[PDB]
Design a protein around this ligand. Structure first.
Ligand SMILES: O[C@@H]1[C@@H](O)[C@H](O[C@@H]2CO[C@@H](O)[C@H](O)[C@H]2O)OC[C@H]1O
Length: 327
């Protein structure tokens, strides 16, 4: 015969791709830890720690590293035949006080950056298959974002981060990850020309991550498909890293859950049609545990499973698209 439950990760493996999630902080000690862990191992073969590899947790003082929470994320992916997607080495948010609380000069922040990168990347060498090296380096104007990194160091912090990362783990796939660059627009044009110049200089930018924090309005699918093609032609691997499809909390639940399913299906169709797309992840998987309600005033219910871990319409919609693709 054949196996009874036809999970997303089983279907992902027959497509030679990964489908997964972001693991909440301290997932092993949730009140409902057991259920959370079970759904996650049943469904997924790639795991990104939601926050526990961020600068705040992992490097809370200039001369102290804390790998403890991160190691728990990695052990769980390992015991569960998942690969680990590392997040994130350089970003403007969730920085500890010893970084934000003092003025820096260029040479000192370069030295700080290199130490952080080499320490975390070497510590997890060979155990983290994909690194978000730089996260959200580009403003909502398609100019460079005016972070502590940029203001202190200049644009070179980007290439140096990638080069330092590759040194510390040559087998890691190094990516640049951003939001709102799924379509052709001012922001993705800037990211495009940016990666195009870094690769021409020999910087090891292996891939691009499209966060895919979207809502019930969907995307311009033609623009998204054309955007994936131009990036792939740069010789990049492509990762959907943080998917969620937030819907208004007010009024017709069924209508919005139906639009959510259609969107998820359309996004998978396009992604499965382009062989440079290697993983699709959701920024979580159950609506019980999502950053959306707290960040996006008036929206929620953005994930695969409801608050009781029952699959929602999008889940079945994506499974059906996965199954058709194999068929
Ligand atoms: O718990 C929350 C996380 O889900 C949130 O993660 C970020 C959301 O925006 C993405 O573009 C980032 O890459 C990702 O790290 O960060 C805030 C935290 O409180």
């Amino acid at each position: 015969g054949h196996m009874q439950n036809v999970s997303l990760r089983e279907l992902a493996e027959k497509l030679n791709i990964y489908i997964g999630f972001a693991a909440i902080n301290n997932f092993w000690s949730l009140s409902d830890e057991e259920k959370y862990m079970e759904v996650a191992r049943r469904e997924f073969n790639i795991l990104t720690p939601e926050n526990q590899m961020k600068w705040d947790t992992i490097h809370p003082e200039r001369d102290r590293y804390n790998f403890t929470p991160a190691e728990k994320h990695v052990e769980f992916a390992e015991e569960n035949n998942m690969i680990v997607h590392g997040h994130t080495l350089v970003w403007h948010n969730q920085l500890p006080g010893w970084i934000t609380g003092r003025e820096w000069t260029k040479e000192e922040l370069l030295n700080v950056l290199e130490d952080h990168i080499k320490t975390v990347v070497s510590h997890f060498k060979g155990r983290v298959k994909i690194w978000d090296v730089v996260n959200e380096a580009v403003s909502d104007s398609g100019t460079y974002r005016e972070s502590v990194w940029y203001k202190t160091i200049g644009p070179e912090y980007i290439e140096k981060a990638f080069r330092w990362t590759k040194e510390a783990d040559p087998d890691a796939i190094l990516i640049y990850n951003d939001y709102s660059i799924e379509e052709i627009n001012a922001k993705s044009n800037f990211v495009y020309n940016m990666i195009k110049e870094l690769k021409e200089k020999g910087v090891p930018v292996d891939g691009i991550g499209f966060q895919m924090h979207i809502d019930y309005r969907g995307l311009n699918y033609d623009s998204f498909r054309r955007n994936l093609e131009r990036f792939a032609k740069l010789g990049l691997q492509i990762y959907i890293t943080e998917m969620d499809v937030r819907i208004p909390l007010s009024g017709s639940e069924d209508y919005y859950l139906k639009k959510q399913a259609e969107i998820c299906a359309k996004i998978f169709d396009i992604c499965l049609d382009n062989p440079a797309v290697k993983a699709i992840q959701f920024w979580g998987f159950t609506d019980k545990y999502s950053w959306v309600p707290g960040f996006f005033k008036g929206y929620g219910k953005a994930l695969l499973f409801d608050e009781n871990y029952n699959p929602k319409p999008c889940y079945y919609a994506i499974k059906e698209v996965l199954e058709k693709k194999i068929e």
